[PDB]
Amino acid sequence: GPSSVAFWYAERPPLAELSQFDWVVLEAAHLKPADVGYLKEQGSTPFAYLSVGEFDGDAAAIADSGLARGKSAVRNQAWNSQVMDLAAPSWRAHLLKRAAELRKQGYAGLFLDTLDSFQLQAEERREGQRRALASFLAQLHRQEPGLKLFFNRGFEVLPELPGVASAVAVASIHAGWDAAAGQYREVPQDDRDWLKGHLDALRAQGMPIVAIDYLPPERRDEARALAARLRSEGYVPFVSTPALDYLGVSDVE
Structure with missing residues (x-):
């Protein structure tokens, strides 16, 4: 399982910066094999x-x-x-x-x-x-x-x-995205209640769980706090934008 995780689906992934995450999930259309090899050389684990x-x-x-x-x-x-x-x-x-x-x-x-x-x-x-x-x-x-x-x-x-x-992975645990509305939207308690039974079964099996939560760039301070909150709750988080076009946060600074 990952120590940290990032997702990047946009063009021009900033590879040096993404390489410092343990697992990185990419839209492969925007990388060449040399880029994937570079991420591995730096010690990251790249996913398509x-x-x-x-x-x-x-x-x-x-x-x-x-x-x-x-x-x-x-x-x-x-x-x-x-x-x-x-x-x-x-x-x-x-x-x-x-x-x-x-x-x-x-x-x-x-x-x-x-x-x-x-x-x-x-x-x-x-x-x-x-x-x-x-x-x-x-x-x-x-x-x-x-x-x-x-x-x-x-x-x-x-x-x-x-x-x-x-x-x-679960998008999302606390801070979510309403794609129909194009609006950031907190995760209703109803959704966390339904997830608990499924996540507890995975936790009991030792399965690593990633939280994909969404906060806009101007709330980067809030994203760091949320990253910390998700880690306290047992998740490996990435808090980013719904386009995954942003160097969001997985851990403390």
Whole structure:
């Protein structure tokens, strides 16, 4: 598990600065293999972002990808991201190929996003999706044992995947982001109450838990205090912006 963690999804990652974090999660499109190797040389462990449950892109972006057959026309679909059928062969094949490409680039692991997006499907279809998700993650782990798998949540499949995840992230614990509104928004107690049962099960298993909380740059003093608060509560935190385009904070100064 990480001593500290940073996420950076924007262009031009400041590599010297990110290299001082223990785990760093990156959008690989913005790095070359020499950059990934540099982070490892400095002693950091670099992860590549990989969205498992959704195709990141508008429609027509997905048209040019050759993956359209696998898109699920869910009711509450977000613009610029498409929920994918985790049982569709072209989608699973795409993800495994991407995993191999990212291994070849030198990434020590993958940060697996949208593990709960199948919950947007019609209720009677969710179990089929959950089982396809679990079987996919088991196949990914078997095919790429050299990639540490850093789950974003995934509570509905973690219990059936012992030894698979190296850590589990939760956005968010105290300070969150309302993407629908484009507003920073504290995490309601309701959300922490629902998380407690899942996080306690992970804590009991010794699973490292990362907190991804959100505060804007002008509240950097508050972000440091929150980082400290999250560490006192057992999390390895990163407190940053929702674009992950900012050198946020994981620990004290």
